[PDB]
Amino acid sequence: FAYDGLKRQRLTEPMVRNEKGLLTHTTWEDALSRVAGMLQSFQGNDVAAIAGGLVDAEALIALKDLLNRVDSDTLCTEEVFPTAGAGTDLRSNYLLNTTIAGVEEADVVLLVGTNPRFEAPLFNARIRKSWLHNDLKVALIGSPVD
């Protein structure tokens, strides 16, 4: 039901700040020239990027490639994952390695610091299904959510 947000508060034109400090519609040519001018004038740690939650991989690599070309490696995300130890070197460090369908084969599930009902509703539904049909035993460490 959230799709109706796609019809509201949309960004439809390039915008740059005018002489008075307000965002004003402009052409693609003008908007990118202003961005390209600043990009050419900076290098290394002076350029950084943050990716939001809804960004696609094609854009993620394109931005990483573009910032790498000015020797910037500060490609960040908003969601934190500890970089201590292996960090992101090993996929298994940050994956749901059992897979969603693998919950139906588990016999005990330990949930730590999560409310999967709202974080991953269809994953929680898979837990309940195993709870209902496989007699799965579930334990939680965290707030006693429903």
Partner 1 sequence: GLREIRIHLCQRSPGSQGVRDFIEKRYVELKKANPDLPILIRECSDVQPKLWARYAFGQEKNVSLNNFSADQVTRALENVLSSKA
Partner 2 sequence: ILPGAAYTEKSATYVNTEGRAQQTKVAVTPPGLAREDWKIIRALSEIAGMTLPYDTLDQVRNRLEEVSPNLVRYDDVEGANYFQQASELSKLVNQQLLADPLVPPQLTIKDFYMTDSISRASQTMAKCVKAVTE
Partner 3 sequence: LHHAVIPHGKGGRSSVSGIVATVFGATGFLGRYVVNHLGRMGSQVIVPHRCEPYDTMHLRPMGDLGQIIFMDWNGRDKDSIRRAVEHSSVVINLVGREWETQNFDFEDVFVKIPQAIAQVSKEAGVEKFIHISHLNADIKSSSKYLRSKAVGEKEVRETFPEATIIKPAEIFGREDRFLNYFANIKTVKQPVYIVDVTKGIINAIKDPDARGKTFAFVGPSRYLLFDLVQYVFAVAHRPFTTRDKVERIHTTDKILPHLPGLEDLGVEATPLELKAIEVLRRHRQPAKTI
Task: Please report, as a single letter, which amino acid is at residue 90.
Answer: L
Pick 43 or 134: Cβ nearer partner 1? 43
Pick 24 or 83: Cβ nearer partner 3? 24
**For residues 27 and 44, what is the distance between their CA atoms, to the nearest angstrom?**
29
**Cβ-based burial of 104 (10 A; exposed 0-12, middle 13-18, buried ≥19):** middle
Q: Residue 130, Cβ neighbours under 10 Å: how many?
A: 19
Q: Which of 80, 49, 44, 79 is nearest to 64 (CA)?
A: 49
Query: Counting contacts by CB under 8 A, is residue 13 touching partner 3?
Result: yes
Stretch that binds partner 1, among 4-12, 13-21, 31-39, 69-77 (CB under 8 A): 69-77
Tell me the C-alpha to C-alpha distance, in Å, between residue 65 and each of 34, 49, 50, 60, 100: 20, 12, 14, 9, 32
Pick 64 or 126: Cβ nearer partner 1? 64
Stretch that binds partner 1, among 22-30, 55-63, 70-78, 102-110 (CB under 8 A): 70-78
Tell me the closest approach of the beta carbon of residue 76 to partner 1, in angstroms. Answer: 13
Query: Counting contacts by CB under 8 A, is residue 21 touching partner 2?
Result: no
Which of positions 16-35 make contact with partner 3 (CB under 8 A)?
Answer: 25, 27
For 90, the token pair is 């090993």
Q: Residue 114, Cβ neighbours under 10 Å: how many?
A: 16
Q: Name the site residues for partner 2 (rule: CB under 8 A).
A: 1-6, 8-16, 23, 28, 31-33, 35-36, 39-40, 52-59, 61-63, 65-66, 69-70, 84-86, 90-93, 95-97, 99-100, 112-115, 118-120, 123, 141-143, 145
Q: Name the site residues for partner 3 (rule: CB under 8 A).
A: 12-13, 25, 27
